[PDB]
Amino acid sequence: DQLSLGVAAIFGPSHSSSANAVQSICNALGVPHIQTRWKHQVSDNKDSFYVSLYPDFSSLSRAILDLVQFFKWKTVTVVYDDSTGLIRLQELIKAPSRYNLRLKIRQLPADTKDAKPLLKEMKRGKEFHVIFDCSHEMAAGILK
Amino acid sequence: THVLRFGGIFEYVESGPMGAEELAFRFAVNTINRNRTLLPNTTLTYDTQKINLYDSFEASKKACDQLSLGVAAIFGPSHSSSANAVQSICNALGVPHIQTRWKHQVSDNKDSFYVSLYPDFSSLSRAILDLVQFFKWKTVTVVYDDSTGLIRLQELIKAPSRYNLRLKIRQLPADTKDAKPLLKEMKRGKEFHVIFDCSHEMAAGILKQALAMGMMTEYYHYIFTTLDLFALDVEPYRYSGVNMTGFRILNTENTQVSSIIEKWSMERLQAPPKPDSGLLDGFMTTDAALMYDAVHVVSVAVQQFPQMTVSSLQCNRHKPWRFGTRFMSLIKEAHWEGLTGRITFNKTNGLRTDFDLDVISLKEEGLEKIGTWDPASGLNMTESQKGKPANITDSLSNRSLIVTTILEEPYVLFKKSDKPLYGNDRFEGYCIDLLRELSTILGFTYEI
Amino acid sequence: QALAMGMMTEYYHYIFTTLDLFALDVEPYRYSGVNMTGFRILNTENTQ
Ligand SMILES: *[C@@H]1O[C@H](CO)[C@@H](O[C@@H]2O[C@H](CO)[C@@H](O)[C@H](O)[C@H]2NC(C)=O)[C@H](O)[C@H]1NC(C)=O
Ligand SMILES: *[C@@H]1O[C@H](CO)[C@@H](O)[C@H](O)[C@H]1NC(C)=O
Ligand SMILES: *[C@@H]1O[C@H](CO)[C@@H](O)[C@H](O)[C@H]1NC(C)=O
Ligand SMILES: *[C@@H]1O[C@H](CO)[C@@H](O)[C@H](O)[C@H]1NC(C)=O
Ligand SMILES: *[C@@H]1O[C@H](CO)[C@@H](O)[C@H](O)[C@H]1NC(C)=O
Numbered sequence: 001d002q003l004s005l006g007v008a009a010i011f012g013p014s015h016s017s018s019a020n021a022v023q024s025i026c027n028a029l030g031v032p033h034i035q036t037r038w039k040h041q042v043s044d045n046k047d048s049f050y051v052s053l054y055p056d057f058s059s060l061s062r063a064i065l066d067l068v069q070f071f072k073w074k075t076v077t078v079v080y081d082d083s084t085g086l087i088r089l090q091e092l093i094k095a096p097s098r099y100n101l102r103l104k105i106r107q108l109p110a111d112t113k114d115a116k117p118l119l120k121e122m123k124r125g126k127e128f129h130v131i132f133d134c135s136h137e138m139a140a141g142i143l144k
Numbered sequence: 145t146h147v148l149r150f151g152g153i154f155e156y157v158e159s160g161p162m163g164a165e166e167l168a169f170r171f172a173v174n175t176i177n178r179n180r181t182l183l184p185n186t187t188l189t190y191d192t193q194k195i196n197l198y199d200s201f202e203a204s205k206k207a208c209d210q211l212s213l214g215v216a217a218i219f220g221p222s223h224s225s226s227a228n229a230v231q232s233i234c235n236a237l238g239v240p241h242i243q244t245r246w247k248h249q250v251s252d253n254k255d256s257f258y259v260s261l262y263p264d265f266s267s268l269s270r271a272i273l274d275l276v277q278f279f280k281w282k283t284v285t286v287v288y289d290d291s292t293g294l295i296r297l298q299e300l301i302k303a304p305s306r307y308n309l310r311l312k313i314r315q316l317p318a319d320t321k322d323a324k325p326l327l328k329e330m331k332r333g334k335e336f337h338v339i340f341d342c343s344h345e346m347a348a349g350i351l352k353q354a355l356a357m358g359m360m361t362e363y364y365h366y367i368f369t370t371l372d373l374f375a376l377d378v379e380p381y382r383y384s385g386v387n388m389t390g391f392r393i394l395n396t397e398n399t400q401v402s403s404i405i406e407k408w409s410m411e412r413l414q415a416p417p418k419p420d421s422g423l424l425d426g427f428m429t430t431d432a433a434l435m436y437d438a439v440h441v442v443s444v445a446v447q448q449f450p451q452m453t454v455s456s457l458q459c460n461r462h463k464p465w466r467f468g469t470r471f472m473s474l475i476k477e478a479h480w481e482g483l484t485g486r487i488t489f490n491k492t493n494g495l496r497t498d499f500d501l502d503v504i505s506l507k508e509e510g511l512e513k514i515g516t517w518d519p520a521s522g523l524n525m526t527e528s529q530k531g532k533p534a535n536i537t538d539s540l541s542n543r544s545l546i547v548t549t550i551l552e553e554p555y556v557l558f559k560k561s562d563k564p565l566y567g568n569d570r571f572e573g574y575c576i577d578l579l580r581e582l583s584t585i586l587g588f589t590y591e592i
Numbered sequence: 593q594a595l596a597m598g599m600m601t602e603y604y605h606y607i608f609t610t611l612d613l614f615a616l617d618v619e620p621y622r623y624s625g626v627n628m629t630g631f632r633i634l635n636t637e638n639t640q
Pocket of ligand 5: 521524526
């Protein structure tokens with residue numbers, strides 16, 4: 001209803017699923033789709049009518065790896081919120097092949113904010129080098 | 145009396161005859177119409193049409209064309225991006241969206257009208273986890289194929305906190321099947337345990353290169369994930385001694401099932417697989433298994449519910465259909481038995497969490513059941529406990545080995561705690577050790 | 593048939609005897625790690 005109305009620069013949703021609909025809209029008709037949040041590429045899609053200005057997790061997940069090298073850690077305890085977030089960290093999970101990192105990946109609980117049992121388990125496990133991976137609205141609630 | 149029009153979306157078969165899911169779907173429409181036991185006074189029909197699996201707009205046109213034609217259930221495409229297009233069609237109108245493919249589920253995707261008969265990796269990866277306590281490993285080296293691999297095994301990747309392991313997750317190279325630089329690093333890593341996680345087509349492709357990389361010894365103890373492990377031409381690997389354990393859902397231990405599978409392979413004499421692939425020729429893929437198991441589950445639903453019919457609803461004017469709010473509650477409450485055995489959905493989210501499995505492994509004769517898994521019960525595995533054969537403890541070399549014993553200190557002093565006990569520990573000392581120290585070397589159950 | 597019975601590791605070493613070992617289809621075995629040290633009298637390292 002914007003395309004039949006006549007537009008030039010669809011700027012897309014901010015979500016995974018509703019993006020890939022409007023991208024394949026924008027592949028057929030020819031209008032550029034322009035994204036803002038990172039979505040999950042399916043790696044075999046022939047779509048090239050899209051750009052995405054979210055900083056790609058190809059390089060962010062690599063940049064985190066260099067910054068854990070810098071601190072010379074051994075016992076990182078990677079924590080995410082949604083299963084998409086594990087894909088957002090692939091250069092860190094593949095690292096124990098390369099280096100002597102020893103991850104222990106553990107998940108913020110579903111349908112809630114309650115990060116007590118995480119931190120309950122996290123204290124007794126004696127880990128101290130934890131990487132979070134969650135939205136900043138979520139993230140402030142853990143530190144509370 | 146009524147036709148109850150089905151259809152849906154399938155793979156485009158650019159110059160080949162037909163894709164293997166679509167053959168099962170027409171074979172499912174056939175089989176119910178012959179056997180009149182299922183479905184009184186009705187028949188079934190289908191409107192199949194193809195997409196490129198990556199063009200959701202092609203799917204969203206071709207879905208709503210069948211909706212404008214009027215269907216009774218869209219049976220959906222077979223790809224993640226093309227699912228969520230047709231997923232959101234069936235949420236909008238109320239028609240069901242019976243799937244045969246695991247897709248990524250968005251965590252906040254508030255939908256109702258869909259099921260997916262492919263067993264959830266929420267449960268399935270607990271089963272792969274259930275083996276590595278049974279096989280008593282420590283040093284798993286999970287190998288995914290693309291970025292959706294590492295999201296499937298999330299219950300496996302969240303292991304090493306407990307059941308203690310040491311995960312070294314590494315990735316198959318994209319854009320090729322050249323796993324030689326990948327496997328060469330695994331050899332110098334001494335990584336003798338690995339949970340290959342890909343299709344069966346890749347699972348032939350790595351082994352056939354892992355055979356040339358000298359990785360197929362009696363040391364290496366592969367575990368696959370694909371539910372068509374019983375479709376590999378395992379014949380060249382069979383004598384070597386490789387322990388490629390795995391899974392299947394497709395129960396070949398039923399006459400009625402295996403009759404269909406050979407009735408199938410006569411129908412799909414059309415489209416033979418090319419020989420050098422490393423794959424077999426006559427085999428039910430587990431996708432075409434779930435596709436044929438799907439239409440039964442819908443057919444047993446309309447058995448449970450008459451008077452269901454076809455209206456023609458239009459995506460241009462968003463309107464809830466009529467019957468789906470009744471009828472989706474029929475589908476989600478189903479307990480059909482089929483090619484995958486106990487189809488039973490989940491009264492929560494429309495997945496498949498309860499299902500039975502066989503654990504098949506490569507013994508020297510071939511693939512062979514070594515037990516049964518389900519969400520309860522853990523690994524019920526018929527180990528057929530060794531140390532039996534026609535014997536107990538050699539029965540004459542170890543009769544009771546009755547030993548003439550005097551109590552003398554420090555040789556045999558006396559073993560007391562309180563409250564008179566028995567066995568060989570009625571006495572203790574230097575010779576009582578030399579009883580068991582001569583027994584620890586050779587092996588004989590002795591008696592004072 | 594050594595390959596189909598998993599004896600083509602990095603541990604084995606098969607000295608062949610025949611004087612045609614060079615003319616053998618060594619391509620699937622090559623990457624593995626057997627060291628099939630054999631012989632040749634044929635002198636293919638000479639242009640004429
Ligand atoms: C790895 O494989 C060997 C043989 O491939 C396993 O040994 C078993 O050996 C008996 C002979 O006494 C055979 O009859 C069985 O069929 C073999 N079992 C299997 C599953 O192949 C050995 O137990 C395996 N070990 C590990 C750690 O996987
Ligand atoms: C039709 O299916 C039913 C199962 O509901 C079975 O009992 C019956 O034997 C089948 N008919 C034939 C001819 O196989
Ligand atoms: C339809 O099937 C029913 C059984 O449910 C049977 O009684 C009836 O004779 C059949 N035919 C018609 C025309 O209704
Ligand atoms: C339904 O799905 C949830 C989420 O996976 C699962 O925990 C639950 O046990 C399922 N219900 C049944 C009947 O098992
Ligand atoms: C499964 O059940 C018990 C152990 O759970 C065992 O006795 C039985 O033999 C197993 N197998 C079958 C086919 O019931």
